[PDB]
Design an enzyme around this catalytic site. Structure first.
Site, PDB file in Angstrom:
ATOM      1  N   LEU A 113      38.125  39.029  78.954  1.00 41.82           N
ATOM      2  CA  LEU A 113      38.845  39.462  77.767  1.00 41.82           C
ATOM      3  C   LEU A 113      38.271  38.786  76.530  1.00 41.82           C
ATOM      4  O   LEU A 113      38.006  37.580  76.527  1.00 41.82           O
ATOM      5  CB  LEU A 113      40.344  39.148  77.883  1.00 41.82           C
ATOM      6  N   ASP A 114      38.092  39.573  75.474  1.00 39.81           N
ATOM      7  CA  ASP A 114      37.549  39.048  74.233  1.00 39.81           C
ATOM      8  C   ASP A 114      38.621  38.292  73.454  1.00 39.81           C
ATOM      9  O   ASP A 114      39.769  38.164  73.886  1.00 39.81           O
ATOM     10  CB  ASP A 114      36.975  40.177  73.375  1.00 39.81           C
TER      11      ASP A 114
END
Ligand SMILES: CC(C)(COP(=O)(O)O)[C@@H](O)C(=O)NCCC(=O)NCCS
Lengths: 115, 331, 69, 111, 79
Positions: free
Chosen positions: E37-38
Site C-alpha cells: 500500500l502506498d
C-alpha cells in the site's frame, strides 16, 4: 460589427482554434437579421479549412456607452449539437454577454475569468 | 374483426438553401414487428385514424450547415401480424411474435442552386392480416362450452383484446402450451356462444367471424345423451355437419393448417376415449371412412389434426394443444 | 518530487476532514475525485510540477476560488 | 421557496446519479451556486431537468424570470441557470471531459 | 472499552476495505510490505480505521503505524 469576411481572434482551448494554419481564422456568414454581426450570435469559422459555427464573444467596435470592449474579435467555438467544442477561454469575457436571450450557459462557465 | 390496409410514410428529406453545404434528411424504412399479448395490454388496436407518418429532414442556414436525417416508421399489432404489400402477395408469412419485415425506400436530397434533386417523403401500401381476431376464429356448435373449456385447460385468465378493424372487438382467451409460454385464441364477438350455435352478437359480427381464415370447430366429444345440451345435436352428426361446412367453404382452407376443437371434455375422463374419438375424427376425412386411396368423396383425404380443449389425461394432450397453437400461429 | 512528503499526507488528512464535513454533495464521489486527483497525479511527477500542484492543493485547502456544497 | 435545500431534495427525489454542488462566493459576479448533474441517460437527464424546472416554476418565484432548458439541442450537454444559481446537466463522462467542478474551483489553475 | 473489541473493530475495518485483499490480516500487517500500500493508500486505510473506531486519531501518530498491532495498541491507549 462582425461583418462579412471578418477575421476573428478566437479565444478558446480548442485544438483547431489553437492550430496554426496558412491563414488565421475568418468568418464567412453570421446568424443575424441584418447583415451586422454583434456579440452574441452564431457566425461561420474556418478552422484549418473546416467550416464550423461559433459565437462571437467580445468585440472592439463601440457598442453601448456603459459596456466594456476588447481590442479585437474574440469568439468561442460551438459544436453541431451547439455545445462548446473547446475547453476554456483564457481571456475574461463580459458579464452582459449572457443577457442576450438564447444559448448562454454553456459558455457562461467554461472560460477562465469574467471581464 | 377484419383485415387492415394502411399507408406507411417514412423519412423526408431536408432543404437549404446555402451556397456552401447542401441538402438535409433521408428516407426511412417501414418495419413490421409482431408482439405478444402484452402489446394488446395497452389499448392501441382501436387506434385507426388514417395511418401514421414519420419525421422530415432539416435545412440549416447559419452559416453553411446541412440538415438532419430522416425517420423510420414501425407498425405494431396487438396480437400477431401478417404483412403483405401492394404486389398482390405477402413476403413475410408468419404470425408469431418478434418477427419483423422491412420495406426500404429513401435516399433524399434537395432542389437547384448548390447540390441537386426534386422530391418529397416516401410511402408504401402495407396490408396487415391478423388471421382472425387473435390467432384463429372459433365456430362452435349447440353444445359449446369453449370459454369454460379454455379456462379449464389453461392457468391464465382470459382478458379483453382488440384488433385493427372497422367493427367491434371480439373476446380472446389465453391457452397454455406447457412450455413457459402462452398462446391465444379468439371466439365470437361479445358474448361467446359459438357461430354455429345461432349466435354471433350481430349479423355483421357473424360475417366477421365467418371471414376468419383459420377456423376451429368446437363440438361435444362426449356422448349425445351425456352432452351438456338439450336436445344435443349428436356428436357425430353435428361434427360431420360443421366439418363438411368448413371443408366445402374452401378446399384450400381444408388442406391448410385448420383444426377442429374437442370441447365438453370436462365430463370426460382419461378412460372416456375422448382423445381417441378426436384422433379418429382428425385422421379420417371428417366422415365414417378413415382413408381413401383413389375414390374419395371429399376434396382431400388424410386432413390435418384436431385441437384439445378442457384438457385431461397425460397422453400428450397439452403437447397436442401446443402443437395446434403453433400450427395456427404458423398460418 | 513534492515540496514535502508529510505535507502531502497533511493535505490528504485535511481533505478527508473536509469531505467528512460535506453537507449536500456526494462526499463519496468527492473522496473518489480527491483520490483520482492524488493517485493519478502524485505517482511519478517532476519536482517543479509537483511544486505547482502542491501550490494548487494549498489554494484548494484555502478554497479561495470556490466553496464546495 | 426553491433554495439549495430544495435543490438537494429535488435531486434526491429525482435520484440523481451524480450531484456536485458548490457555493459560489461574491468573488465572481456570475451566480450564487454551481451545480453539476450527471444522470442515467439523455432522456433521463432531460426528464430530470424538466422535473427540476417544473418544480422551481410551480413552487414559487412568480416575479422571477423564467429559466429555459439550455442544451435542449445538445444531447450530452445541457444547463439551466437559476435566479441566483446555475445547474449544468451533462454526463459524468461529459462532466469529466469538461472537468468543470475543479475548473469552477480553480480560478487560475487550469490549462 | 475492551481492547479485544478494538482489535476486532480494526480487523473488521481492514477486511471491509475493497482495495485491500484479505490475505495476511495479521497483527503485524504492514501497508507497503505485507499488503503493498502506498502513502495515499496508507492514509486511506487510516481514514477508514478512523471512520468506525476513531475520529480522534492524530495525524502524527497515524503516519507511522504500519501494523495492525500498533494501531490496536494506539486505539487501546487513546481510549
Ligand atoms: C510522498 C510519496 C513519495 C510517498 O510514497 P510512499 O507510498 O510512502 C508519494 O506519495 C509520492 O509519490 N508523492 C508525489 C507527490 C507529487 O508529485 N504531488 C504532485 C502531484 S502532480
Amino acid at each position: 460589427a462582425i461583418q462579412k469576411m471578418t477575421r476573428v481572434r478566437v479565444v478558446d482551448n480548442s485544438a483547431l482554434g489553437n492550430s496554426p494554419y496558412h491563414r488565421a481564422p475568418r468568418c464567412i456568414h453570421v446568424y443575424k437579421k441584418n447583415g451586422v454581426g454583434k456579440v452574441g450570435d452564431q457566425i461561420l469559422l474556418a478552422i484549418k479549412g473546416q467550416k464550423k459555427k461559433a459565437l462571437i464573444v467580445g468585440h472592439c467596435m463601440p457598442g453601448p456607452r456603459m459596456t466594456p470592449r476588447f481590442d479585437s474579435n474574440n469568439v468561442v467555438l460551438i459544436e453541431d449539437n451547439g455545445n462548446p467544442v473547446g475547453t476554456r477561454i483564457k481571456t475574461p469575457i463580459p458579464t452582459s454577454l449572457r443577457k442576450r436571450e438564447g444559448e448562454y450557459s454553456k459558455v457562461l462557465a467554461i472560460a477562465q475569468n469574467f471581464v | 374483426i377484419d383485415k387492415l390496409r394502411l399507408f406507411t410514410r417514412g423519412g423526408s428529406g431536408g432543404m437549404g438553401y446555402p451556397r456552401l453545404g447542401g441538402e438535409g434528411g433521408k428516407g426511412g424504412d417501414v418495419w413490421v414487428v409482431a408482439q405478444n399479448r402484452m402489446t394488446l395490454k395497452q389499448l392501441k388496436d382501436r387506434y385507426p385514424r388514417k395511418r401514421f407518418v414519420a419525421g422530415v429532414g432539416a435545412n440549416s442556414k447559419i452559416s453553411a450547415l446541412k440538415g438532419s436525417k430522416g425517420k423510420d416508421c414501425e407498425i405494431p399489432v396487438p396480437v400477431g401480424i401478417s404483412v403483405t404489400d401492394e404486389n398482390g402477395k405477402i413476403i413475410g408469412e408468419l404470425n408469431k411474435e418478434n418477427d419483423r419485415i422491412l420495406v426500404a425506400q429513401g435516399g433524399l436530397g434537395g432542389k437547384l442552386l448548390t447540390n441537386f434533386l426534386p422530391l418529397k417523403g416516401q410511402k408504401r401500401i402495407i396490408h396487415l392480416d391478423l388471421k382472425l381476431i387473435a390467432d384463429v376464429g372459433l365456430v362452435g356448435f349447440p353444445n359449446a362450452g369453449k370459454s369454460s373449456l379454455l379456462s379449464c385447460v389453461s392457468h391464465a385468465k382470459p382478458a379483453i383484446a382488440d384488433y385493427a378493424f372497422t367493427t367491434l372487438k371480439p373476446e380472446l382467451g389465453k391457452i397454455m402450451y406447457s412450455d413457459f409460454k402462452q398462446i391465444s385464441v379468439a371466439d365470437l364477438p361479445g358474448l361467446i356462444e359459438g357461430a354455429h350455435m345461432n349466435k354471433g352478437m350481430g349479423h355483421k359480427f357473424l360475417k366477421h367471424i365467418e371471414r376468419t381464415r383459420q377456423l376451429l370447430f368446437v363440438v361435444d366429444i362426449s356422448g349425445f345423451q351425456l352432452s351438456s345440451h338439450t336436445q344435443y345435436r349428436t356428436a357425430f352428426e353435428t361434427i360431420i355437419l360443421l366439418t363438411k361446412e368448413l371443408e366445402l367453404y374452401k378446399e384450400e382452407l381444408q388442406t391448410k393448417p385448420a383444426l377442429l376443437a374437442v370441447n365438453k371434455m370436462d365430463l370426460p375422463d382419461a378412460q372416456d376415449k375422448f382423445h381417441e374419438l378426436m384422433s379418429q375424427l382428425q385422421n379420417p376425412k371428417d366422415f365414417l371412412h378413415l382413408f381413401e386411396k383413389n375414390m374419395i368423396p371429399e376434396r382431400t383425404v388424410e386432413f390435418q389434426h384436431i385441437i384439445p380443449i378442457s384438457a385431461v389425461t397425460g397422453e400428450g394432450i397439452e403437447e397436442l394443444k401446443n402443437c395446434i397453437r403453433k400450427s395456427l400461429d404458423e398460418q | 518530487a513534492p515540496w514535502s512528503r508529510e505535507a502531502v499526507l497533511s493535505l490528504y488528512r485535511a481533505l478527508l476532514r473536509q469531505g467528512r464535513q460535506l453537507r449536500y454533495t456526494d462526499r463519496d464521489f468527492y473522496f473518489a475525485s480527491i483520490r483520482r486527483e492524488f493517485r493519478k497525479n502524485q505517482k511519478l511527477e517532476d519536482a517543479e510540477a509537483r511544486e505547482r500542484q502542491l501550490e494548487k492543493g494549498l489554494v484548494f485547502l484555502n478554497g479561495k476560488l470556490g466553496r464546495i456544497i | 421557496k426553491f433554495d439549495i435545500d430544495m435543490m438537494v431534495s429535488l435531486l434526491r427525489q429525482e435520484n440523481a446519479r451524480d450531484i456536485c454542488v458548490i457555493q459560489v462566493p461574491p468573488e465572481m459576479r456570475y451566480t450564487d451556486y454551481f451545480v453539476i448533474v450527471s444522470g442515467t441517460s439523455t432522456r433521463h437527464l432531460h426528464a430530470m431537468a424538466f422535473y427540476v424546472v417544473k418544480m422551481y416554476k410551480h413552487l414559487k418565484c412568480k416575479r422571477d424570470p423564467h429559466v429555459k432548458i439550455e442544451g435542449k439541442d445538445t444531447d450530452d450537454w445541457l444547463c439551466v441557470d437559476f435566479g441566483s444559481m446555475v445547474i449544468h446537466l451533462m454526463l459524468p463522462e461529459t462532466r469529466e471531459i469538461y472537468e468543470l467542478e475543479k475548473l469552477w474551483t480553480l480560478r487560475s489553475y487550469d490549462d | 472499552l475492551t481492547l479485544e473489541g478494538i482489535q476486532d473493530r480494526v480487523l473488521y475495518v481492514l477486511k471491509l476495505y475493497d482495495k485491500i485483499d484479505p490475505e495476511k490480516l495479521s497483527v503485524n500487517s504492514h501497508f507497503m510490505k505485507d499488503l503493498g500500500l502506498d502513502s495515499l493508500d496508507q492514509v486511506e486505510i487510516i481514514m477508514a480505521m478512523e471512520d468506525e473506531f476513531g475520529f480522534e486519531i492524530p495525524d502524527i501518530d497515524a503516519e507511522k503505524l504500519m501494523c495492525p498491532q500498533e494501531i490496536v495498541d494506539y486505539i487501546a491507549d487513546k481510549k
